Subunit: 172 residues, 2 copies
Amino acid sequence: SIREIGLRLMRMKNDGMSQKDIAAKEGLSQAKVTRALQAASAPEELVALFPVQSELTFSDYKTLCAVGDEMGNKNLEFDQLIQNISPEINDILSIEEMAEDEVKNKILRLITKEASLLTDKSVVTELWKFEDKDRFARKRVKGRAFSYEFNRLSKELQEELDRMIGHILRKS
Amino acid sequence: QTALQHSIREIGLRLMRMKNDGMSQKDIAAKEGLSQAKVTRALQAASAPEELVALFPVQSELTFSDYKTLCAVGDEMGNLEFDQLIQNISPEINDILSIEEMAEDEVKNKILRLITKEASLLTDKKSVVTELWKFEDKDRFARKRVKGRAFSYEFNRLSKELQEELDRMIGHILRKSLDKKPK
DNA sequence: CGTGAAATCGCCACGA
DNA sequence: TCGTGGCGATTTCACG
DNA sequence: CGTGAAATCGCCACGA
DNA sequence: TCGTGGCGATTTCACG
């Protein structure tokens, strides 16, 4: 709600209009001006996540701005987050019982979750999914170094997997 | 009535009887009239592990030199330990009594060479780094590491071409694992 | 300085 | 024996 | 609780 | 801008 009104007032920030005039070019209160503008800066990628953007509280957009800064504010890191929970987002959007306001709530608290542990490095990439608890394949990137890590897979696989990488290097 | 030997090992026993009555071996080397050295060498063998003493057919073809390397093996392993070991080898041990031609000559050198071997693989029981392409750079590298039933490939500072290459290639390989049909 | 849920280890056991 | 699932015991790890 | 060599990390700089 | 060797600055690691 306040969001749209925000992105709408935003364009008139770049039109060369000062909050003042706008608060008047809309019959709105200057305070509500900064409110809206502020809510309009929140990280879109997350904005989108929410299925019923109408139930978002100004506090929500605000907390979102926070989950953003504390996280730097750049795309890829978001996308990193977006996926680390993407399945639960769709998971919840499957439940039927809980109201729509309870959904966003659950969803929000979720966005503050990742934000805290992923900003406390551990950039991984579950390159496979077994139904087994222990058993895995993953890639890990950190600064100027990457590494793959598998566990509990066929010795042949290991074999196969050794043989190859040895080459790609040899191809240098 | 029974007494006096030369299977060197027996002498021990007696001297062991005596050593127990609080008698310096130095005394013994005189009481009985032998060289302190040997009196220890004696005793030394008299302590060779009874069990391991067994596995041998002709304990008479056992050389001191071995006997040492035996009690050596006696304790060198906590001194359940003896039993399990008698096992792991029991086959290949007996699997040698068969072999037609060969008496107390190369029985030892194999029975031994085994008992010890399959008795060393016990006392001592982690990651295992390895290199792939030792570079020239300071900290640029490509290694494999195996801390268990889990392996992994480590890499530092490399051409984004290299990554993708693997990235896609690893996925290539992985994917190969499985395709279901029909209808 | 406990806590429980999630990733892991440890060890048993059955088929090449 | 050696390799690989399974399943319970234990370590990790973010909270309260 | 040092103490140095080697393994890593900071960051500044150079060519599509 | 971004992706890549370089070398100083520092953290790792096994001992004495």
